[PDB]
């Protein structure tokens, strides 16, 4: 059921297992557990030790260089909850340099309430890709798991498949198992956080992780909100006060703790807002008799004496030590060398402070984007200043964009100078607004706020250029914008025009093809584009190019990004057009959509035409030998400085000349295809070639705008009996035993007829064959024979076409005179 045993506040284990045995009689850890610095150990030393009583840890679990430990499935076989009340460098579970360790084996951990997990430098660790952290951590992107065996090598992972559930992580499913014999337990989505039983039923609402019997507060292993007398409750009822955000205690416990802290060396506990907390917040003071902090009749802030007067903030746990502070008796150095935005936690812990006795310094915060998390920061006294008498030292902030919201936020800097350097995404406008609002306008000297380093990678020209005339055509775009001139017009070096295709709308500022334009003379500047890709939406905006100036704020001019789409045109020829002759009168067409649609393909055009048979074949005697009838980029870095220097030299010479000179005295069948990539043509002559003219054409009613067609040759299949000769064979015998054979030709054969075969044989003799070609057939009206021996003969007739050889006719009997 619920937690038995004592509470065993968090402890530390070092150099031997002798002090590790004190975890046997407790199930909940009210603190942080660290097992670390274990060198004189062996793998057999751990198999004899196991702690199944442990259930959940309030703060975190840290493992650092514990030799001989291979898996945690025996040490902590019932751990399920890591609350993360106090973290270890914004990490709730750290596994660092765990040599001789192969797998985690924490097969009962379900939810980590707060924090993240960092696992690093374990050359023998596997089963890291076989675990789903999304089911446990709210923010899975905050994990940092590198330098293991799963990336430097290819160690095998064997999740039992014959049962481990598979879950998609990026785009594919894979089984989730803690070890080779422990599938990762997964609950149904209806059981969002309360957990499921063995058969998968949602537990009680006040339940978390796992439960014995569903829908029962008293049959759970981890109370989600609070624990009290073996029962999980929404809040502690009276007279019980919330304690450590995880359990409810009476007044006696808090009183005993407070008295013991007073009567010893500390967390002198008090009571406020129905909770026993160590120190009550600003404006309250604990009474003598009772422990409740009555509000004070005056402005008493909660001071936080910073040791050494200079505290470095680099992690969630380091920022948490300032929780509830209002007056900071020292200086803050904000330095998060991260890569993930910790703004939420920073605003949760900080932001309740009002004044800083010393200075504020923000250095190398790669992840910071805005200092708005200082919600209630107003005064910076600057009694202790950074070296060089500085009260706000911002340096090398890679992604800092805004300091505050000056429309609402107020600030006050008493003493000390400003400092800004290498904030590439922070613009000078914000810095000057801060100078004006704070009241430190006349305090900074030259080079205190750098100009060539701040905002160099931010597009904040704060001056608008408006396009006055934009025109679009087939493949070129004509642009025009209003002229711009700095106070010294010779400073204008021209314009930069940036264009890039934009399939979607939201496009960033500042690929991105660069073209230069000469400045105008003294007729808007304008520019004409060359060779655009038709039917495409582009992004256009003009950025000025002007000489740098050291004396003051530099200059500025740029145009807001616009979107323009070039028109449509004729599409390309359809790709891969093929034809198959499935039937004797049917042809099927297949083709692909054009590679360059150049718009929207509204329809297709298919054209049909018959090609007459080759008259050359009709005029050949194919009975001769040889009758094999056919069977059918950027810009150099030095160059730009070169033209800058040349222009500056010209300006300098002009200025010198003016100084020296002036002195101040005192038809074919077809059809229309509608969104079909294939076609079937009917009503075609058998075994006849057809040429297919195929067009992809994207405009029908307002005239066709579409290019040339694809030409292919398709020949229909031949009829089976087209070459079969119809009509009885007629034989004629003259006085001199001269035989002439007559028959009716196949008037509609597969294409044409080249020759005929006549085979005449006497009864019992050998078969004699004869060929009659087209010219012979026309001249003799069939077959003519000379000098026949007496007897009974059988004559067989067949035809030859382009398809092949025709069937023979029924033999006919005839006999000649013997004289």
């Amino acid at each position: 059921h619920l937690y038995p045993g004592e509470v065993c506040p968090g402890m530390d284990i070092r150099n031997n297992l002798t002090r590790l045995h004190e975890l046997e009689n407790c199930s909940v850890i009210e603190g942080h557990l660290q097992i670390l610095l274990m060198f004189k150990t062996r793998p057999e030393d751990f198999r004899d030790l196991s702690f199944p009583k442990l259930i959940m840890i309030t703060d975190y679990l840290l493992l650092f260089r514990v030799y001989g430990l291979e898996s945690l499935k025996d040490l902590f076989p019932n751990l399920t909850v890591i609350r993360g009340s106090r973290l270890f460098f914004n990490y709730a579970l750290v596994i660092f340099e765990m040599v001789h360790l192969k797998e985690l084996g924490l097969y009962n951990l379900m939810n980590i309430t707060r924090g993240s997990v960092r696992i690093e430098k374990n050359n023998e660790l596997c089963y890291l890709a076989t675990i789903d952290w999304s089911r446990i951590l709210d923010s899975v992107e905050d994990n940092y798991i590198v330098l293991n065996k799963d990336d430097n090598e290819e160690c095998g992972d064997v999740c039992p498949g014959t049962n481990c559930p598979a879950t998609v992580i990026n785009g594919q499913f894979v089984e989730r198992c803690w070890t080779h014999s422990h599938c990762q337990k997964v609950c149904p989505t209806i059981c969002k956080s309360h957990g499921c039983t063995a058969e998968g039923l949602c537990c009680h609402k006040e339940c978390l992780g796992n439960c014995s019997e569903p829908d029962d507060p008293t049959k759970c292993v981890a109370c989600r909100n609070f624990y009290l007398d073996g029962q999980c409750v929404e809040t502690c009822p009276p007279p019980y006060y919330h304690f450590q955000d995880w359990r409810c205690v009476n007044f006696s416990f808090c009183q005993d703790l407070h008295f013991k802290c007073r009567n010893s060396r500390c967390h002198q506990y008090v009571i406020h807002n129905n909770k026993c907390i160590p120190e009550c917040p600003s404006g309250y003071t604990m009474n003598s008799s009772n422990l409740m902090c009555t509000p004070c009749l005056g402005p008493c802030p909660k001071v936080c004496q910073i040791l050494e007067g200079e505290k470095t903030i680099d992690s969630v746990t380091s920022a948490q030590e300032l929780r509830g502070c209002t007056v900071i008796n020292g200086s803050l150095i904000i330095n998060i060398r991260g890569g993930n935005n910790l703004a939420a936690e920073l605003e949760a812990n900080l932001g309740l402070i009002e004044e800083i006795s010393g200075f504020l310094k923000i250095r190398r915060s790669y992840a910071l984007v805005s200092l708005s998390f200082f919600r209630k920061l107003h005064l910076i006294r600057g009694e202790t200043l950074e070296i060089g008498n500085y009260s706000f030292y911002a340096l090398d902030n890679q992604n800092l964009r805004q300091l505050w919201d000056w429309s609402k936020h107020n600030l006050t800097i008493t003493q000390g100078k400003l400092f800004f350097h290498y904030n590439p995404k922070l613009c000078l406008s914000e810095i000057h607004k801060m100078e004006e609002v704070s009241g430190t306008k006349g305090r900074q000297e030259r080079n205190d706020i750098a100009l060539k380093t701040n905002g160099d990678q931010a597009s904040c020209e704060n001056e608008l250029l408006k396009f006055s005339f934009i025109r679009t055509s087939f493949d070129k775009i004509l642009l025009r914008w209003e002229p711009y001139w700095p106070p010294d017009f010779r400073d204008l070096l021209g314009f930069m025009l940036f264009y890039k295709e934009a399939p979607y709308q939201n496009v960033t500022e500042f690929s991105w093809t660069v073209v230069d334009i000469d400045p105008p003379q003294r007729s808007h500047p304008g520019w004409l584009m060359r060779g655009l890709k038709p039917w495409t939406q582009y992004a256009i905006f003009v950025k000025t190019l002007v000489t740098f100036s050291d004396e003051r704020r530099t200059y500025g001019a740029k145009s807001d990004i616009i979107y323009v789409q070039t028109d449509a045109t004729n599409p390309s020829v359809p790709l891969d057009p093929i034809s198959v002759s499935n039937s004797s009168s049917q042809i099927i067409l297949k083709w692909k959509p054009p590679s360059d649609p150049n718009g929207n393909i509204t329809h297709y055009l298919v054209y049909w035409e018959r090609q007459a048979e080759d008259s050359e074949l009709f005029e050949l005697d194919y009975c001769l030998k040889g009758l094999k009838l056919p069977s059918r980029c950027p810009k150099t870095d030095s160059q730009i400085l070169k033209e800058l220097e040349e222009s500056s030299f010209r300006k300098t010479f002009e200025d010198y000349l003016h100084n020296v000179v002036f002195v101040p005295r005192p038809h074919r069948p077809f059809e229309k295809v509608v969104n079909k990539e294939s076609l079937v043509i009917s009503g075609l002559r058998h075994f006849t070639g057809y040429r297919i003219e195929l067009q992809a054409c994207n405009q029908d009613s307002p005239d066709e705008r579409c290019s040339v067609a694809a030409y292919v040759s398709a020949r229909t299949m031949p009829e089976a009996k087209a070459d079969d000769i119809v009509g009885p064979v007629t034989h004629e015998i003259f006085e001199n035993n001269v035989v002439h054979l007559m028959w009716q030709e196949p008037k509609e054969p597969n294409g044409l007829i080249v020759l005929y075969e006549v085979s005449y044989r006497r009864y019992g003799d050998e078969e004699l064959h004869l060929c009659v070609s087209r010219k012979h057939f026309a001249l003799e009206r069939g077959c003519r024979l000379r000098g026949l021996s007496p007897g009974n003969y059988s004559v067989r007739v067949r035809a030859t076409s382009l398809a092949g050889n025709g069937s023979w006719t029924e033999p006919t009997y005839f006999y000649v005179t013997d004289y």
Partner: peptide
């Protein structure tokens, strides 16, 4: 008219403001 005059524009500015008397040059 009060505006920044540089180079050539300064030249015609001087030519408009004076030129009936001639530009001064110290002896």
């Amino acid at each position: 008219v009060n505006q920044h005059l540089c180079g050539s524009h300064l030249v015609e500015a001087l030519y408009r403001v004076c030129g009936e008397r001639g530009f001064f040059y110290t002896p």
